[model samples]
Target: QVLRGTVTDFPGFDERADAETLRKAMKGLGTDEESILTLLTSRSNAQRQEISAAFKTLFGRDLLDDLKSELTGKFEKLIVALMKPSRLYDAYELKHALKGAGTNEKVLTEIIASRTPEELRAIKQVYEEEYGSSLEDDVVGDTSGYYQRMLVVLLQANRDPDAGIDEAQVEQDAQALFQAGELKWGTDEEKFITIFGTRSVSHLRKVFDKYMTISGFQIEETIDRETSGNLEQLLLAVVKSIRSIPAYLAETLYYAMKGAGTDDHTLIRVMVSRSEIDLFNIRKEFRKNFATSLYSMIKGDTSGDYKKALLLLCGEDD
Candidate 1:
């Protein structure tokens, strides 16, 4: 079955033709920003990769380098982001998050928490190969305590597969969470970690329901009260992801553009990364959850070629 994604494979896609078009767009004195954004944003990542390869083979030039030289500002960054393989882009994002002075814990939490086990495994391998260091080690080095422990668990990328739910087990899990957090004085962070880290999303959703029945508070409420710092964020991310990843991401996009100046890094990352995966659903959720649609939000908040590129990736308005 086809996924409900914004960017799909462009019908009758010809890699060499796309490569030539891109070359022509950037070749002359004035760059065709419209053509570049339209072509790149419409094609799937796999299609883009083929176009990149074709561009190099046909012109003996890196497509990304040419685009970089021809384009400028946020549009350039967005185009450059579109060119990388998805997992490699993620690996690089993780590297950037961990590198330098302080950690970008939000990036760390978002990527590690939302990615599938297979995706995470591939990312870890790519991270090790590309950076010559373990992703887990880098995370551990940058973070501490329960936060570090929870991140390591997710980085292991071995969540339980979905089997048929057991009623007794669901009750047990809910009770365990209740005892660990709301029912107890000092929270047992390990209990929270083990349960949240490994359980299937379906299983966790049931547990959350059971948890509310037993504890009289939502799991998120308990998490907020019990944990602090990065640990709390990670745990809540897991819960949000378990409940609805699209919903979680919709909120992310909302906050990124809400209030003061935009969190462009976050805005760009989610748009570039999820455009081909779940941006369609993200758009739906955005419209349902907020007063404005994501498309309208982007139009209002951004301008120039960057806005056009984001809108193209956004695919459609709600």
Candidate 2:
């Protein structure tokens, strides 16, 4: 069965009910955290956007500003994550990650690795429209060397979305990876960058398996041993996303929660970002990869209405 978002069971999904409910949830003497969570978490982001528009028209107040005023902490972040249009939210996240002194290469990796051809283009356009500079220029300014090479390639959205493996082509690509990393005295970073950058995710999966068959080392092992720093992280993310986008994101979620301190921003971004797309699928991968329930995991790590909101989005264990 095709995995559906947890919010698929939306009861009586009337924009009017949503608008009225959201308006009342935020308008009172005290904020209704329960009602806020109930409505937002239960609706898809599309539905939530509709509710946002209706709330403004109905109450003549900006819903986002009201939400910012009423909500606090991680809960507030999650609500805000839920409110924005997904790509626009991603654009905002990318901007935030790029705004600081160094740059959050991890955020850059996640967004580039996971998006489709159209989504990637949208991000480029959104970045251009919002910042008045090309994403490539920002990346070039921020990074150097092979890391810059990979980011520039990724910015092209060069991958063929419907690509299928030609067996001869697969062997050639597989051999290319082996010769580039395992068989060479010095790593041919350009070959690795070109294949990962230009191939479809479907084609990359075959290349990954063929590379393992041809070389004793798994592709990731070679990447870790041969490459360093942000370049390594970016390539690994590319490979993992090619293998399984949901699984990669599951691992990301685990990273956010498994460490001593919770990466609440990443947690909210991953949870809210995937909620409508593949949170159900990611939940399964999280359970399998981490050997525990995400519901239980989040419950252990978080508290208050934030915990409840995340759990609602997480849905029941598989």
Candidate 3:
């Protein structure tokens, strides 16, 4: 079945032809930015990888390196991002976040919280293959405290499989969260961690509904009032993602552009990562929350081939 955000299926995809078109786009007197954008943005990531391999086979050169050389600025960034396998791209994003100074905790949290179990397992495998260090070891080295504990657990990719909800068990989970946070003198962080990290989203939604009835506040509000620092952010992230992953991503896009200057990295990441997966839903959520079109915001904030490529991925605004 076609997913909500999936733009094109490339029904008659031809890797050799795509490669030659790309080669010609770069070979012309001036780069055919429009043609490159049309070809790459229209094809799925799987198609792009095949095109890349065929381009190499035919040209005796790496398509990624050629794109980097021919294209510049944010357009180049978009093209480069599309060339890598999704799992490898994710692994690279995680590596970049942890490479220097303070970690980009939001990036780490967003990837971990939003990804499915199979996706997480793939990310871990790619991380190990690319970095020569275990993803868990790097996380453990970079973080400490209960925040660390929660991440370590999430990295295990052990969330229970989706199943029909049990109303009584939902009541028990809500109470467990309450006891871990509000019902006790001091918050029991592990209790929050275990319930949140292990439960399926379908089940967690029930727990959140039950929690509001029992506590007179939403789970998100409780996490805000009771917890702090990275742990709070991580737990809040889980709650937000559980509530609506698309909405959470839309909020991420908003934050990336809310300030005086744009966070190009974040803007690009959300745009590219969600392009094939859930961008249609993300656009809807962005408009609903921000009271403006994401296309308009990008138009106002960025320029050149970068803005054009992003708008293409963004598709027509609803």
Q: In model 1, where do residues sit more than 4 Å from their true spots?
A: 183-186, 223-228
Give the worst 10-residue stretch by lDDT in candidate 1: 222-231
Model 3 lDDT vs. the true structure?
0.83
Which regions of candidate 3 fall more than 4 Å away from where they truly are? 28-30, 164-169, 179-186, 223-228
Per-candidate clash tally: 0, 0, 0
- Candidates' lDDT values, in order? 0.86, 0.81, 0.83
* TM-scores for every predicted model: 0.91, 0.89, 0.88
Q: Comparing candidate 1 with candidate 3, which one achieves the higher TM-score?
A: 1
Per-residue C-alpha lDDT of model 2 across residues 67-96, encoded as one tens digit per residue? 999988878888888888876888888877
Q: List the residue pairs that clash in candidate 2.
A: none
Q: Write the per-residue lDDT of candidate 3 for residues 1-318, one digit (tens) a residue.
A: 234774566989999999999999989578998999988888888899899899999998898888999988878887888776766888888888898847588788878877777888999998999999999899898889888899988999898877888889899989988767674314777677888898888999989989888889887765553244777788888888888888888888887887687888888888888787888888888898898988889888888878887888888747
Better of 1 and 3 by lDDT: 1
Q: How close is candidate 3 to the true structure, as a TM-score?
A: 0.88
